[model samples]
Target: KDKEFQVLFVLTILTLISGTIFYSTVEGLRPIDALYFSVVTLTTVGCDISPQTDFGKIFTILYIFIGIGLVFGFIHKLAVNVQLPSILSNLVP
Candidate 1:
């Protein structure tokens, strides 16, 4: 149910911070660019600038798999467990 929020929150922050640090240190990206890259990667949007190393490429691939699932699941749980309830309650009275 709503428990997914906490799982999603921790997973997201952990991945984002790791990605930011990895991008900045390994790719020499500016902090902003690194963070932007992390967000775009996690959300499964198109990516432009990317990691230089093959390791980074592989990391990106794995990150995409886990990150996309958690993010979408987070949204799904929020919509069903939280938003739908609030909307229905308001509509009832």
Candidate 2:
């Protein structure tokens, strides 16, 4: 479980960094905005600041595609870390 948590944590960090880079370069947004946008996008949370520019839209599409995997990965890790024992106990019964 520790290893799984660590792996998920590191992947989440890496995805955030990569998304920031994409947002900065493709959308020409500042570092802070890029990071914020990336976080909101990855979590599938709606942002108040919508992407208006063409480049921003492009970045959004790319970010969404890349983020899907990370989102699923994080969810999987969370489920395993939280529910694995319960699942095992159920199976034993």
Candidate 3:
């Protein structure tokens, strides 16, 4: 409900999408591949996929640093502002 949380969520979503676009444009990856790479990298999954170009590699370093911050910020906001106690009660019963 807070404007701060709303902005954090939007920025996280946009950062993920921007990674998808950047990989496709700079690395010649297919759309699916770029998306996969973005999700995998952001989650710290470390799959077999990798960037062949030096630029792509460097971009990924910065992307992960920035994306991870946004992802954590969104989660922190959700925990702070959302009704987790209600969900926890449901889980207990």
Query: What is the C-alpha local distance difference test score of each model?
Result: 0.82, 0.81, 0.83
lDDT of 2 by residue, 1-93 (tens): 778778887888888898789778776789999899888888887688887778778867887897778777787887888678678888994
* Model 1 alpha-carbon drift over 4 Å, by segment: 86-93
> What's each prediction's TM-score?
0.75, 0.66, 0.76
Better of 1 and 3 by lDDT: 3
Q: What lDDT is obtained when candidate 1 is compared to the true structure?
A: 0.82
Q: Which candidate ranks first by TM-score, i.e. highest?
A: 3
RMSD to true structure for each model, in Å? 2.2, 4.6, 2.6
lDDT of 3 by residue, 1-93 (tens): 589989988887788789989988988888888888887888777778678889888999999988977787788779877758657877894
Best of the two (1, 2) by TM-score: 1
Could you tell me the TM-score of candidate 1?
Answer: 0.75
Ranking by TM-score: 3, 1, 2
- What does the lDDT come to for candidate 2? 0.81
